[PDB]
Structures are given as C-alpha cells and as structure tokens.
Design goal:
The chain is α+β, with helices and mostly antiparallel strands. It contains 1 helix and 2 strands. It has one domain (1-50): Irregular (Low-density Lipoprotein Receptor). Strands 1-2 form a two-stranded antiparallel ribbon. It is classed as transcription.
C-alpha cells in the first residue's frame, strides 16, 4: 500500500517538530525537556507517545 500517499506524515493536533508537545492550555509548541520542571503538565504527558 505504498502507491497513493506521499510527502510526509505530519501531525493533526500538534503541529510541532521532533521533541515537542503542543499544549491547548497556552497554545504553543513546548519542549519535552520542559518536563524537567513541569513533569505534571498536559504537553508533558502528551509529548511521549501522543
């Protein structure tokens, strides 16, 4: 099932790059590294395996 779709597999509810999580709270692409200070954040838990 290769013939058909191409380009690049982009996100849908988190338009960010490698190693980032989009939070609906503040509305922005946060960094997974932020967890170091905010381990209990929406984007934190959403980052690893959305």
């Amino acid at each position: 099932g290769s013939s058909g779709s191409s380009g690049e597999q982009a996100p849908g509810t988190a338009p960010c790059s490698r190693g980032s999580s989009w939070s609906a709270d503040l509305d922005k692409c946060m960094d997974c590294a932020s967890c170091r200070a905010r381990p209990h954040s929406d984007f934190c838990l959403g980052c690893a395996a959305a």
